[PDB]
């Protein structure tokens, strides 16, 4: 009876997205920027749309290693670009320092970094469904949900030969949900819009007749 609570139901930490720097091979750029998308996986998306308005603090962790699952010591800079501030142009761009961009310097050898993001939205809660136009690409888009981009880079000075994979985990604390919504039957087409395929799929799997059971 305590596992039906909305607080426990959203509890556990999960994989929000996998990003890669890849500075070694044909792509030498040497950093990456990962806009925070909680909807990333269609499984995590279908449990969120259950509720229309929800207010929660997030907590992150970055599990990193090379392509060998081998983790030698080499330094990484995890920066958090808050919503409304400019993004880094290139691996040396002066945005990588500033002041106001909170950063985390962690070697690979260390156990994974961890950090806690507060509630960033202007409105008193997030909205997963916003009717009406922000001011037809525009229809139903919340401008106020952006949580920031978590730009990453490897401090070591020039062109290491090592592509560094990294995984990003999220978990939701202190969650509070408002008016409920029925779960989605139809498959998803694209990320930001509900649009569903022409051909409809039934909700229940058919049987022989209105009568026969099993």
């Amino acid at each position, epitope marked *: 009876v305590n596992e039906a609570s909305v607080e426990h139901f959203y509890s556990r930490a999960g994989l929000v997205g996998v990003v890669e720097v890849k500075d070694s*091979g044909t792509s030498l750029d*040497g950093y990456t920027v990962w806009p925070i998308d909680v909807m990333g996986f269609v499984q995590q998306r279908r449990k969120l749309e259950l509720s229309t308005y929800m207010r929660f603090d997030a907590e992150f962790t970055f599990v990193s290693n090379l392509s060998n699952s081998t983790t030698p010591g080499m330094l990484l800079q995890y920066m958090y670009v808050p919503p409304g501030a400019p993004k880094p142009d290139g*691996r*040396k761009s002066y945005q990588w320092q500033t002041a106001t961009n909170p950063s985390v310097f962690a070697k690979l050898s260390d156990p994974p970094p961890q950090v806690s993001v507060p509630f960033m939205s202007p409105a008193t809660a997030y909205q997963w469904f916003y009717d009406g136009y922000p001011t037809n690409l525009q229809y139903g888009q919340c401008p106020n949900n952006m949580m920031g981009h978590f730009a990453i880079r490897t401090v070591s000075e*020039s*062109t290491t030969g090592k592509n560094v994979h990294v995984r990003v985990y999220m978990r939701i604390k202190h969650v509070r949900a408002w008016v409920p919504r029925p779960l989605r039957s139809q498959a998803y087409m694209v990320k930001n819009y509900p649009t569903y395929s022409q051909t409809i799929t039934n909700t229940a799997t058919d049987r022989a007749s209105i009568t026969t059971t099993d």
Partner: antibody
Amino acid sequence: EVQLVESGGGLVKPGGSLKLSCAASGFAFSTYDMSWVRQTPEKRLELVAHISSGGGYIYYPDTVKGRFTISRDNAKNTLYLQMSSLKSEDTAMYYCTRQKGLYYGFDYWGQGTTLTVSS
Amino acid sequence: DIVMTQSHKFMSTSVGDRVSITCKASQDVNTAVAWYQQRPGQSPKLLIYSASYRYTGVPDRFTGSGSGTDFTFTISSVQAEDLAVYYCQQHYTTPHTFGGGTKLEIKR
């Protein structure tokens, strides 16, 4: 397809200053780093200056450091090079190139313009 | 800085032949290197960058290989259009640096 043109190059006397301006068309011009490269009469090539795509980072070699200045305008699709106090060795032809980052190779090269420092 | 020196200021060959040029690094550059094609009176084109990989559109007869401080740029089959000066680059660190140049010779 793509066009990199330059201007301003020409004979000049020592000490003077001259603005080489590069103009581009056929691609999105704010998404690419840019650079200048000069080719000595011996055809020895060397770097001149570098700027990031959005103006974040600007790099100068030790020789031209403080003597030149580079800037770009994403609205005009131009790349400007302000260069002063020209010595003897500053004569060579200057190419206007394009990159996708710091360490990528230079894919395009302007037709190049000469520069000459003499009495 | 870090100097990239090329062994031969000139090399000779003929059409259909096979020629391969080296490049030598002042210190360890890892795999970062690039090879350029400068035809007479023309803006030097990009061919092969970062050891083996070659830029989009470069014909397949152009190959390269190496690692560390010792590099090689291999032409499977020489043609007429292949006459020009070649250069090797170091993009491993700033500032970038170019080799002294190498000029082919087709002797008929």
